[PDB]
């Protein structure tokens, strides 16, 4: 709080004496982890000649005399520490050198009684704020988290790997990633409300995008095989700990197959992303626990897992009266009621990973009618570790039953969306689609909050 | 326009007896890529008992009394054409099938006097709306462009090969792909309008980001070494043939470099691009000639260049009355009349790939000054073909001078962005920034048009 004013003072005289606290360009020669991993194996308090020009954050000090000692820590947390040259060189790194600061170091590495001892040294940036977190303000300031706390910089890099992962893994299997708009006419492709912001172009509202479903059904239509969009989606509505107003979603479309075959690919992905970003499926939590999920995983049906968990059959066929009946003896439409009531009874108790599917006609409008099976739709959910995670569809291809499906809701809250419907009745052929949620994805695998899963939330 | 009516009563007359025309799953066994690759050279007019299950659109038909054919189409533009089992099957081909539907065929492949021969045949789709188109009706059904036009499936395929080849590119140097808020509280990293939209969770407005980097730059405080975004930017303002509101932009960030070395690697990028998504480097144009991108790349500066151009000494000390002089003699601020002069005078002629470097301050507040010349800061643009694709900055990371640039920056027109403020003053290490253009790129390298570059625009 005071010391924010000393550190003002060591840039200003250092500018007036003609020592640039901010040069361009220092000649880093290398990385300490590529220093590190050239000499792994030293006779220590030894010397060699082998010299580099390091840089890194002075975070440990300890000042004495004739030789000072301090911790460089590069960004990605690799650590190495620092009569050689010039006693004012050691008169200026006293008083010009504090812990938060970015330096250079020429010189030869040696072992200590791994340092690297000086030729030359120069400030690369100069901290005016000295380092120090609540969850809350590890989130607002995750510049300072990612220096001072490791696994701040282990969970942005996880992220990275899985989000890697999951391109490769599709890119694999010959998925081409397209760009759809984030700016619509009308926000379609799934249930939410939209944020609404106002062009200057065309003096007219336009909708940020709730889904890219709608769109990237257009280019099956337009004879994309197989295409997947891996961005952010926006549901202006509120926050809690699987839910946020800006989330990254992936959205995947595959022609001839069906929710079947994109609940294997569901698998399958998740596996290989688990493989590529942690290294195994026996998944270690902050609990102490272990989660596993390799092998197969189950295959649920909604109705009737709902009626073995209340004790009596239910169909399509059951009425709103009898399930308002049994959703008050526990504690609007049919559909609605069928998922709660699972999802009170099945989806609480679920802790192995499963699939559940054959869902409620009323509450799926994008999504085919079962093929045999009548009143339900080809739609599965994934749980894992009781976190809905992602959805598959056999996709609704019929445009008057689509139409249809629309007015129903239209009615319920009269526009619909007439290009959407247009594109449709040019013929879109058979295709599964899926969604799944990034964070949820990462806080399924790891037990980590979603207000840790991206760099810079709010 | 009456033909509408009819597709719709073959629909209903398709349910009512029975017969699926929205299947939910068809087993289709090979793409008819892979049906032609896996029967190059075959002896024309001669069979084999190679039996496969193929689908695609029907664009083409040839129906006669005994035998009909159509051309099969599948989404990527390749094409197959199509006694043998049952008479009902021909009539039903003959009243169910128009142009425009999808269709699946089981049977043997042989070789015309390469089509296949049917055991079995089924719709996949029915379509209401046979296929056909003005450049605006192009864009406005895109859908229906990608079917009947063959340039169109080659410009989205090649959109897609260079976005991937970029990935490639900065990944096999090491970087990182990163996610940051599209939502913000202030919208900075660039000069133009946001487009403002109001939160329910909060109820206060949020912007859309108009770039990434100050974000990213967050990032490079964070600790990392090599970051990129590549995602959509919005800019509230006016459309043209080089810009528009929503576009996909590239924003680079590298520790330890210059201008001058993220000039190399932009250069190397754009050829790594060209390499894997054109397979040239002289590159073809509609106009019949050919752009060669290939070797090395001129750099001039901006205040001689402009100097040359006039015939006369401009320098950082010009004063605005001269220049204003100067700026009528041919037809607000210094900067603003520097860039302005030199573009209607240097940036109109260039034709061959060129690097301009050292700009006026004023008008770049987020780079730092030039390390040696006065009144200048280390940025460059690229132009080519005379279209400006991308820039690159040595980053300014002096906390103390970025806040005076930002306060001249708001007095002109007082909020600023403390949090970015703050991060800048627990220090940024020296690093260079690039933003490229992604519409901008593809037309610099096919002179396509920005409508034409993204699948789906408005
Ligand atoms: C990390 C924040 O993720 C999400 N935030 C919001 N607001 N909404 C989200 C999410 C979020 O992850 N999802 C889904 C969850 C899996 C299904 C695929 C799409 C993503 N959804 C929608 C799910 C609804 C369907 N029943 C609840
Ligand atoms: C395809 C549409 O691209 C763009 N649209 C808009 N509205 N604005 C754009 C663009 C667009 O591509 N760019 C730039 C061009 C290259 C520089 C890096 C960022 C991208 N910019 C900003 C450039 C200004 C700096 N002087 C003009
Ligand atoms: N838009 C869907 C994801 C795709 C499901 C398959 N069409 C959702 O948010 O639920
Ligand atoms: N945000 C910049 C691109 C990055 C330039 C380097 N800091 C722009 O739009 O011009």
Same mark, same amino acid.
């Given at each position: 709080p005071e010391q924010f004013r000393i550190r003002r003072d060591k840039r200003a005289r250092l500018l007036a004496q003609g020592r640039?606290?901010?040069?361009?360009?220092?000649?880093?020669?290398?990385?300490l982890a590529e220093v590190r991993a050239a000499h792994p194996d030293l006779p220590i308090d030894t010397a060699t000649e082998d010299i580099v020009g390091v840089a890194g954050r002075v975070i440990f000090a300890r000042n004495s005399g004739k030789l000072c000692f301090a911790t460089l820590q590069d960004g990605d947390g690799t650590q190495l520490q620092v009569d050689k040259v010039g006693q004012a060189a050691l008169d200026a790194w006293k008083a010009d050198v504090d812990l938060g600061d970015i330096v250079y170091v020429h010189g030869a590495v040696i072992s200590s009684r791994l340092s690297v001892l000086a030729d030359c040294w120069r400030i690369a940036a100069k901290s005016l704020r000295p380092l120090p977190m609540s969850e809350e303000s590890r989130v607002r300031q995750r510049y300072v988290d990612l220096i001072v706390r490791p696994e701040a910089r282990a969970v942005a890099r996880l992220r990275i790997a899985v989000v890697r992962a999951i391109r490769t893994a599709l890119q694999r299997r010959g998925f081409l990633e397209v760009e759809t708009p984030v700016l619509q006419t009308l926000a379609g492709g799934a249930a939410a409300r939209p944020f609404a912001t106002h062009s200057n172009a065309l003096d007219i509202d336009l909708y940020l995008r709730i889904a890219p479903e709608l769109f990237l059904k257009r280019c099956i239509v337009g004879g994309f095989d197989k295409v997947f969009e891996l961005n952010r989606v926006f549901r202006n509505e509120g926050a809690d700990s699987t839910h946020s107003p800006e989330f990254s979603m992936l959205e995947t479309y595959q022609t001839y197959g069906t929710y079947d075959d994109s609940a294997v690919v569901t698998r399958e992905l998740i596996q290989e992303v688990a493989d590529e970003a942690?290294? +195994?499926?026996?998944l270690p939590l902050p609990d102490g626990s272990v989660y596993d999920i390799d092998g197969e995983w189950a295959t649920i049906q909604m109705y009737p897992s709902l009626s073995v968990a209340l004790g009596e059959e239910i169909t399509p066929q059951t009425t709103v009266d009898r399930l308002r009946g049994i959703a008050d003896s526990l504690g609007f439409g049919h559909g609605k009621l069928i998922e709660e009531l699972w999802e009170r009874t099945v989806g609480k108790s679920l802790s192995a990973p499963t699939f559940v599917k054959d869902f409620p006609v009323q509450t799926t409008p994008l999504t085919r009618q079962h093929r045999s099976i009548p009143?339900? +739709?080809?739609k599965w959910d994934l749980y894992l570790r009781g976190i809905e995670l992602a959805t598959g569809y056999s996709e609704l291809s019929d445009p008057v039953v689509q139409r249809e499906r629309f007015a129903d809701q239209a009615r319920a809250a009269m526009v619909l969306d007439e290009d959407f419907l247009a594109a449709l009745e040019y013929g879109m052929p058979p295709c599964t689609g899926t969604g799944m949620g990034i964070d949820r994805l990462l806080m399924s695998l790891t037990g980590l909050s979603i207000r840790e899963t991206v760099l810079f939330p709010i």
């Open positions: 640039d606290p901010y040069p361009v360009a220092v000649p880093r020669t290398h990385t942690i290294g +195994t499926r026996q009143g339900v +739709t080809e």
